[PDB]
């Protein structure tokens, strides 16, 4: 039996809020960027964020109950989605801008030096704007991020039943938050649907991103770390 299912909605929210990873900074060094320096900064940053993501993942209710193998699979499936929804969340209050770090705030123009970056930048910006116009709350955000972790790899596997039961718990929690915020019953399931459909778009961005990461590995110009190489290999094989 997993203690995640015995938690109340408030206990779930507080647990997720407390598990939140820190906001990291980029290297504090000269403009404009080149393709090499741009990808350098983003890669270094994502790599450091990954270490904190694992800590966060272990604190998401239900995740500790999985085998090591299943924990590995889920993170391998979801890590870029999780980085992206974090990026999009951070950027909400900065329309037209992507806040990769407090000292690394980029617009679509700075993407042109890297092939396909403008395209994904636009997708990320569209997502941020959507969250902003929806007035997404941090409590809702941490629920969505946990859903991505638990859902994205679940159909590439009693343990699937566990994940689904925890996913149900997180749904209960989202609805509880919206009811708490004063939304009508109709507004609650409309909003729930709206948020979960955005996840399909996040999946789409991660897949596009994973393609570019593979080609960046092949180009052999921008050094990926061993951790990222292992994350990347997991998706192409």
């Amino acid at each position: 039996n997993s203690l995640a299912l015995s938690l109340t909605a408030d206990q779930m929210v507080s647990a997720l809020l407390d598990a939140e990873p820190p906001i990291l900074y980029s290297e504090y060094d000269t403009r404009p960027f080149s393709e090499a320096s741009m990808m350098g900064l983003l890669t270094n940053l994502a790599d450091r964020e990954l270490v904190h993501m694992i800590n966060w993942a272990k604190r998401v209710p239900g995740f500790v109950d999985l085998t090591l193998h299943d924990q590995v699979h889920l993170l391998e499936c979801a890590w870029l989605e999780i980085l992206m929804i974090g990026l999009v969340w951070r950027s909400m209050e900065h329309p037209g801008k992507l806040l990769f770090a407090p000292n690394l705030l980029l617009d679509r123009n700075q993407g042109k030096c890297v092939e396909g970056m403008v395209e994904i930048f636009d997708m990320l910006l569209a997502t941020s704007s959507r969250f902003r116009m929806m007035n997404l709350q941090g409590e809702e955000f941490v629920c969505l991020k946990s859903i991505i972790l638990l859902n994205s790899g679940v159909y590439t596997f009693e343990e699937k039943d566990h994940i689904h039961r925890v996913l149900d718990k997180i749904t209960d929690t989202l609805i509880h938050l919206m009811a708490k915020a004063g939304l009508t019953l109709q507004q609650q399931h409309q909003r729930l649907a709206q948020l979960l459909l955005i996840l399909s778009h996040i999946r789409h961005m991660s897949n596009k991103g994973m393609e570019h990461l593979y080609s960046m590995k092949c180009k052999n110009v921008v050094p990926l770390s061993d951790l990222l190489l292992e994350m990347l290999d997991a998706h192409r094989l």
Partner: peptide, 12 residues
């Protein structure tokens, strides 16, 4: 073997 293994097992 896998860095992800080490990171999950030493998680905090």
């Amino acid at each position: 073997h896998k860095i992800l293994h080490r990171l999950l097992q030493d998680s905090s």
